[model samples]
Target: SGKRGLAYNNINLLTAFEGGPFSWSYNWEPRPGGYTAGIEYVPMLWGPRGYGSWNADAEAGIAAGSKNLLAFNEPDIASQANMSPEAAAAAYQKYMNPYAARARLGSPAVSNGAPPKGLGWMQGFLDVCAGNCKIDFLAVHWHGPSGNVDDFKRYVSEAIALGQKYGIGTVWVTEFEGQGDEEAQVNFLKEVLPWLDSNAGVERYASFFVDNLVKGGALTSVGKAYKTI
Candidate 1:
């Protein structure tokens, strides 16, 4: 249980993971409701659309004892954060930098595409940062096309190496899941959980599809695997 957490929306679904492999969760917003005894909430300034709410709520969260701040979601994709590296850098400074003194700040979560999408966009953000950004870790999303553990291993290894390359040692897979059916998700988690736990560079991770994890107040198929593995 070195790095398992939640990329969740429903507080109702949270308790299933409580006293399980999870200890952290985020709801793509500054604050989410319904306290689970053990799961810690990580605040995300998901995008500019949420900034106004984030401004007030993030401060409240910090005061309420939150430990980390997640930056924009999928900055490399136009439909999400929709920010170029320059814009991201500017906005990061304006919004996230102030929290650096208290809480750990993660980089914008980037999609696992090629240039201008994956590592290219991450590197671009750093170039624009130019030692000015107060990034404590890298937040990335890797929703690979299949359940092949080898490719997942490769990508994550490179991701960790990328962080070490910049002297930023922590890599948080803020979002990830194998594509396809429930069995696919389960298989993916079973294989990758060990890798994630074994990797010293991987600080934390949160799986996608929280909606599927719990149904009718109990763990679903994927959630059962998540709980067991």
Candidate 2:
């Protein structure tokens, strides 16, 4: 299933004994999965054990399935309770190293995921992993508070700089939103969409849209806050 089997019937690592009972039975699924209802499994899979191996699996599966887009979609979590930027970076190394190695060989491989605060790209660790992995792109998360253009621009600019520093070649906002109710979402679009259509800082609005359009599939973007913007 998706990485560490969070949704697997009997393979969830969460309840597999905190070092004891080695099992994954539904009865054994950890209560609440360790943190928020859904975030518990993100770290381990994104972490050391599952990184390259999991990415490798996805690539192989895609090849076997004859899928043209051989990309892996795993959430490293960005929401408050699901947040852990350090661990996410570590996982990034694991996955990216393999991606880059393959790229060097002329194979097409790429990936994207949500990152945390400043230096959200977590360049230091990703570098360590890239010494061995094959990352070809960078991905970030964004969904600003409504009616808050200044704050939104600031946070988003930080994301873009981190992406550039990492030399990702291209950056991706794997997730985003300003959607809540019809009026707020609509108003946000009216106010902020034009700015996005333009540019926030050094980042190209076109680049943001293009990266996400390729990575996000049909998922519509959404904002982190509601009732406000």
Candidate 3:
């Protein structure tokens, strides 16, 4: 069924999770995991003929949120789990060079690139895009067991460095979670909430994800994480 679409003009922020190509050798079911499993389609989505101007759409998202506009349940592939440093660096530059410029001019969370897998790979790409890079908030992808305080901090530092280099301030853990069982979720919330509140401190970002996966039009027994301040 088709749904109504909103009117958007001039995109600013573009988003991507895992790429289309398998990360390396990862599968997709029954806890599929590997290098190939985490590929995303962002580069293709926002390229010249791709998704086109995502910033405008992101603005709409920002407006809908109570205050700080944030959107989520997204994925980002920063893992260089299999590719060589040089290969990963080239891939990063190939996709990020153009977008970095767009983001620097005041796009949402579009500035951060170099999806992780290897921080060195990201730094290498940034070096190539020196003048054009002006990251707003250093963002990284954190999925449960894969996410850790030290690793997140490292990403934060890299973001800070990029910001300082270009005079941008702050960084956001755009995506962070320890996904799994109820206990894991609870533990994740308990542990991560504090980090987000204090360290990451993404306090005001809009909880747009709430209305995202909601089922039916009313309350039901099916439980999920309900965002609160």
Candidate 4:
């Protein structure tokens, strides 16, 4: 019932967990092979690494339900998108900024790493963009101990504040998880869910890994907790 979303990985799970708590779904790529289970798809511009890029044109990857469009995935992280702020700004203008006229646009997701690799990298991007690039929201990721819900809230709040300072009010927690054993993960969800539900700054969120929550097309204990509405 709140703003929970699915950070999908498997093509089959697209139809498996439909019409539940998830109001939106994204699979890193622009398209999920059209296996949507009657849910909205938030297309992402993941550098050519995206699966559907070959087909992603004016019509191939985007969907009628795509009200939101995400930029690169963790451009700050070397192993991930790994794009520099200057280069990302250029790409954003070409592939994402123009789309802002049609849909809400998000910044390149920043990793949970410290300054220079996390929000700091995002700062550099905004500096390079300097208003030519359109960013309606900020995309962020977090992974930490479940025992510290306060810390989780703190990080997300910090991101929200950062976005607000830059005129972008909403923040999308693209991927996050309380890294720990299964019980700890569930415990984290128990507390984290209410925070996201009540926090207006957070427009949307998705848990870190889908496989940890779903099994054989069904939700596991952790999944049941994550399915909170």
Best by lDDT: 1
What is the TM-score (0 to 1) of candidate 2? 0.44
lDDT of 3 by residue, 1-229 (tens): 0110111111111111122111111011111121222221111122222124444443432243211222111112323233333443353344333344333222123222344433444455456545454334433344435235465456556655665565556544433445555555555455544555565323111112222313443311112332321
Clashing pairs in 1: none
Q: Rate the local accuracy (lDDT) of all candidates.
A: 0.83, 0.35, 0.33, 0.80
Off by over 4 Å in 1: none
- Model 1 TM-score, all chains together: 0.94
lDDT of 2 by residue, 1-229 (tens): 1111122223233332233211111111112122323222211122233434565554653343211111222333333223244444454444534444233211111123333333433454454445443444443445555566566666656655655565545443333455355456556656654554455332222111212212123212321111112
**Candidate maximizing TM-score:** 1
Q: Indicate the TM-score of model 4.
A: 0.92
- Candidate 3 has a TM-score of 0.45
How many Å off is the CA of 51 in candidate 4?
Answer: 12
User: What are the runs in model 4 whose C-alpha is more than 4 Å off?
Assistant: 48-58, 61-63
How high is each candidate's TM-score? 0.94, 0.44, 0.45, 0.92
**lDDT for each residue of candidate 1 in 15-93, tens digit (9 for 90 to 100):** 6776677778888877787666666788888888887777787888788788888999998997888889999999999
TM-score order of candidates, best first? 1, 4, 3, 2
Which sections of candidate 2 miss by over 4 Å?
1-57, 60-90, 101-133, 197-229
What local lDDT does model 4 show for residue 176? 90
